[PDB]
Amino acid sequence: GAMKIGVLALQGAVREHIRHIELSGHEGIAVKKVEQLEEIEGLILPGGESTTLRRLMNLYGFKEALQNSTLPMFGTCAGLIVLAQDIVGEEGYLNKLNITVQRNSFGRQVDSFETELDIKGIATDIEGVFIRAPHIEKVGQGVDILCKVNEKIVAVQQGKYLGVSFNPELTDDYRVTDYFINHIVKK
Amino acid sequence: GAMKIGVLALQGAVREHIRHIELSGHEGIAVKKVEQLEEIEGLILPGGESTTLRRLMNLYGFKEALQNSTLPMFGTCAGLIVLAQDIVGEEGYLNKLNITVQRNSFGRQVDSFETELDIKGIATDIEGVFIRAPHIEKVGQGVDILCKVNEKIVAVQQGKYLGVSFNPELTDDYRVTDYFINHIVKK
Amino acid sequence: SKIIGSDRVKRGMAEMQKGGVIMDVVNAEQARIAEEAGAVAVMALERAGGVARMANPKIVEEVMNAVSIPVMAKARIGHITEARVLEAMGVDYIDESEVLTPADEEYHLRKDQFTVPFVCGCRNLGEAARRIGEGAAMLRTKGEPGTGNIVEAVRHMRQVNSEVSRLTVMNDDEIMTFAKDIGAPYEILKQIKDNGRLPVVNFAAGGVATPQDAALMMELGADGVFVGSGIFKSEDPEKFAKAIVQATTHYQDYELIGRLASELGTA
Amino acid sequence: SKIIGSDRVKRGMAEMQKGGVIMDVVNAEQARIAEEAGAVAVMALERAGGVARMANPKIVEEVMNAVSIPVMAKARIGHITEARVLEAMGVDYIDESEVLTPADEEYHLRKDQFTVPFVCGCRNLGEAARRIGEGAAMLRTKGEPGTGNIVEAVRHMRQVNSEVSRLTVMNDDEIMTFAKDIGAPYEILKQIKDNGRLPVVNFAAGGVATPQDAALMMELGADGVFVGSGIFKSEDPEKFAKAIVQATTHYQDYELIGRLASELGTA
Amino acid sequence: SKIIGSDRVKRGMAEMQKGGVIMDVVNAEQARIAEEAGAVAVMALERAGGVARMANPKIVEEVMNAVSIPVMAKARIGHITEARVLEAMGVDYIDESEVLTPADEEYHLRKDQFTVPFVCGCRNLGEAARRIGEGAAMLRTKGEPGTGNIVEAVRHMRQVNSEVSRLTVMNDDEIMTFAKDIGAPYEILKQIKDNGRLPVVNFAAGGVATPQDAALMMELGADGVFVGSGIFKSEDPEKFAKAIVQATTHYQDYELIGRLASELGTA
Amino acid sequence: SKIIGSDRVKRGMAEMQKGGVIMDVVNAEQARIAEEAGAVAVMALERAGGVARMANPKIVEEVMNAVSIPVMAKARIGHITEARVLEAMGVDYIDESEVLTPADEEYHLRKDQFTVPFVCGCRNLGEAARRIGEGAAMLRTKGEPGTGNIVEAVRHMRQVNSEVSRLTVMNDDEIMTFAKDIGAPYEILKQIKDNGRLPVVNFAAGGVATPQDAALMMELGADGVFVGSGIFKSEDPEKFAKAIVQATTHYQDYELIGRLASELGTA
Ligand SMILES: NC(=O)CC[C@H](N)C(=O)O
Ligand SMILES: NC(=O)CC[C@H](N)C(=O)O
């Protein structure tokens, strides 16, 4: 019934993800220590600064604990970067999604935007907010491409792993977290 | 499941009765107009001034509506006076409980008190607060005497009608309202 | 056993009094009208012209023997023996009233020594918390008695309500100096924030003179109305008191209030 | 469907009222004269001597049933239940009037909660913008009621007119601190500059007592005239009200105004 | 379509920035350390001795090309062309900073005309609401920059937090005059009470100099920490910035903060 | 079971500390001298020249591992995370010290949330009662630290002693307003009068610099002596500290104090 879903509370919009978890009818846990990973059935890597998030995960055993964990994951911006196997110009981190992603494909904040997104299998009018968002350059075998914007894909799903370039937590539409919890963690 | 219980919100401790209803797992409705009586499955006549309560009920059709209503009732102090068929020195009002009750049997407020009460069928340590409370002088046929204090009975139950001289709403113990809702209204 | 005098009993006597109006009274025949009009209690009293004292015990007993609703009498500020005499008569409530000429311009009564509950006037959270600390079991607004002007009652009610609402959501680190700023007992402010509401019942008192500004007090957050002698200054005190009761209990039936105001027609 | 209560309806009730004069009224027979004299509406009221309240609903209904033109009644400042009772009676406009003794010396009414439009007094762009923000749907000058001295009406009208004219051509960079200086809602000032005029109708009210200074108000920029009881203090209230209507509608026919003034001859 | 410049995007750029520390930077090699230490953004700047202006676009571009985290630059108060030039360079945030010598001692920038979000300093709910009304998309405490004394940051944070907490539970009737008292736009206060929190992110800025009072800011309610040049005034700026990041993210692991403080050892 | 953190334990840690002197310490070898001189505890610290913070945890651990007597460290006023970090290290006492630059110029620490006892400075019964209400488990005089002038310590000790002696025999009717006059929690004053003494231990602190004015503090009513620079600014700290201990324990053996003063001979 009521499932406990964790949000990596190292840095970023953790309150918004916890609120969206509570909107889906579940309990949210802001995880800051590795031990809390043993108390949740799902993990959301929230939006923030991928550099800061990497630096924080590398210092408390989070990288080794999450590289070896069998927990399903939902990465937004930065979280998608952290989940990718390869990063253009840098190196892959958690190596969970067989994709190659480039950081800051659009302009800087003076070029961030909002739009409507038709995500395959969720909804046809998701309110997507792109804030210096990355884009997925290449996909591997077994990676479903859920949503693209101008031939540049931004939303993918590989089995029990879900990655998006936009940040749905900043909106009042909680359908993405609902889909993640009810069709990935509940499977 | 969740039952709507009404409290006569003409005068008296209505907030406390609504709180105790909410503590029992049900919804409370502060009834001030006769029409609201059609929306509740049970009625609580709260503690207050019996004179003011009579004067308010006589002026909005509440006396005729409640004398003809088939709704179960729970009267505390004043509410017990209003529910009685006979009142020493005065006249009976709603004529719901076949009992004769005397108002202000103890002293004035300089003689009000608290005590422990062993109510037959509820609990053995109810926290009873008597504030210029009446006492039931005589009982009729079919009136169960639930609790007495100093040979003066103060808690009775006749079928779907429950009367008490004390005010349990002023305490944190909500067992009396719970018993009323679960064993009288739910019957 | 018989836990008589517990604070819960003192403040429950007034907590199960809210929703009604207490009108003051001079003689037994006015108390008859007050009772038969729906008043929850009567304020027995005798009378910028001199020094006001306690109402003679004879008149208080005359008012007491005439009604079955609770009767409360007024005592001078800090007057120990006056409140003690009112307690000996069995009076249900003593009003440590600033309307009467005070007896101790510095120190209020030691209300927690008595077994009879007290009601005191307040204009902000500071005075209210101080009265509660001294042992008061009920609060009212100081207002402007004898003027029919609701301005002061509104001001005091809104002030104390806004201050307690601020305190209910105030940081725990900031409460202490807050108690230092408004001159209030600190533990009482902590209890206010813990309970989430004012630990005692606060009524309106002062400029209430029409059904409109009697229902306005309940609309503003007051739990009841203290009405002065203006009731017996109209052409028909019976209908006036009845309309005040109706407007106090149904403070949001505006057509009812309009009809009651149309019925009345005096100053 | 039925978009009832939209701000456009509230302020249109007064926007299609400009060009005429609203004279106050005490009884039905004065309302007859007001209607048959060309008044666009009547101000139903009952009366430095005491505390002024709402006019008894009986007299307001007596004035209401006597005329087909809109009737408006006065409510005390910040008096919630008074304005609510006037709303329940169907009164077309409530004047949150500072002439009556206020009820809340700190906070005005929450006018946007009501479905009946309100009219409030103002002396500068600050008070006007604050009243508009609180939900007022009409504005008038505070003036000096009961004196017949037009000085205060002229002063307030000219002040608010000069301030809104300044704001209509004021730099966008300077508006915010301007709103901070006059104590006004900032979005309302932006809307003022965007629309180019005052977002609501501003009437004259106070010292109007002759046709001359009734036409002077329209010459100064007012949209209408609020006239007090001085009409029924003359030798012929009918001719006086008729002349006031004529001078308000044709405020630049000076020979007509001269003839009307020659006809009249009282204080 | 492509709703670029919408307020939600402006303030989301900072809302998904909370939980981290923004340390200022002078040259590219300091920005490298800031990025590799866990900073969420860098404040590009050049330097009681003269008049401070914008940091030369050359040095801002040098800092920009060295890091992938967002870089923000400082502009003079009310300096239109300075903020416009910083916007043309693609700077992620402009700080309408009171640290630099102002350019308009009366009127702040017209921040809602820009498509780049702004961050402004505040000391109470009044200044914060005024900055939000002018179009600011982020707030920080004014503090006492260049002193290492946390007193002013604590004071401003606690003041604005207590005031917004008061407003979240404040009566709807009293808000307007409240906005008049603190000199704030009224609609912004209504939106504050409706949302229940401050409509934008408020960071700490000023006296932050140790990990202890960096975690204290997060304990007090701040969403992040603005750190000055003191990082590069220690013996090891890398370890200092790393410890500040650690204490900002885990502001309640007190043994961790103790170890980080033991490691550091400078002024 | 294990009733850890009860107020009786907090204040007993200091109640079984009276009769001895706590001298502050910078490094391990000075703590060695302090222990070998008869000190009951040491005050670990690191240092009108800047902003004073917490003493680096490294130096506090260095002092901790060097002695078996309790070691106490200083935290900034209202600094939550500083006191929490000192608590995590196992420090026996935290001094919410006004000597260090404060962190919250308005609100003191929430001392009753901690499980480690606190010591605070006071200058009158008001400040003492406020600190106790906030949860302090020990009191000292503010004095004039770093001056060697005993005037302020004498003044504060005598003031608080005279005020508590007045309260011990003060009328029950007058206590409440008394608490209002000195700005103190009322229940704490009632507890003071009930116990007949100050509910916690009050030490001397500040101008102590010779054995004479160290024994004078015990003669005046102090329970112990906090010594600052009086020992670690002389030519011979060992003999100086030994003489201070002797004069503190035998504060009425005047020939002994004279001999100890003859031995010493510096500023
Ligand atoms: N998540 C964001 O704020 C986007 C920018 C960030 N530097 C990143 O690419 O991870
Ligand atoms: N309910 C009470 O407050 C008790 C006294 C009241 N007059 C009565 O007997 O009804």
Residue numbers in the entry:
A (entry chain O), B (entry chain U): -1 to 185
C (entry chain H), D (entry chain I), E (entry chain C), F (entry chain B): 2 to 48, 56 to 275
Please share excerpts from the published article on this structure:
Here, we investigated the biochemical, structural, and dynamic properties of the enzyme complex responsible for vitamin B6 (pyridoxal 5-phosphate, PLP) biosynthesis in S. aureus, which comprises enzymes SaPdx1 and SaPdx2. A multimeric assembly of two enzymes, Pdx1 and Pdx2, synthesizes pyridoxal 5-phosphate (PLP), the active form of vitamin B6, as well as its vitamers. Pdx2 has glutaminase activity, converting L-glutamine into L-glutamate and an ammonia molecule. The latter is delivered to Pdx1, which synthesizes PLP using ammonia, ribose 5-phosphate (R5P), and glyceraldehyde 3-phosphate (G3P).
However, Strohmeier and coworkers observed that a mutation in one amino acid from the catalytic site of BsPdx2, H170N (H165N in SaPdx2), stabilizes the Pdx1/Pdx2 complex in a fully saturated form, enabling structural analysis. The phaser found a solution with a final translation function Z-score/a log-likelihood gain of 18.5/1565, containing 12 SaPdx1 and 11 SaPdx2mut. However, during the refinement, an electron density for the 12th SaPdx2mut chain allowed the tracing of the chain, although with missing parts. The model was refined in Phenix.refine, and the final model was validated with MolProbity. The final model for the SaPLPmut complex showed remarkable structural conservation of the SaPdx1 dodecamer with minimal structural rearrangements after SaPdx2mut binding, as suggests the comparison of Figures 4D and 7A. According to PDBePISA, the 12 interfaces among SaPdx1 and SaPdx2mut have an average interface area of approx. 1424 Å2, with 23 hydrogen bonds and ten salt bridges, supporting the formation of the Pdx1–Pdx2 complex. A glutamine residue was observed in the active site of SaPdx2mut. The Nε atom from glutamine interacts with the catalytic cysteine C75 (2.3 Å), as shown in Figure 7B. Unexpectedly, for one of the 12 SaPdx2mut molecules bound to SaPdx1, the electron density was observed to be rather weak.
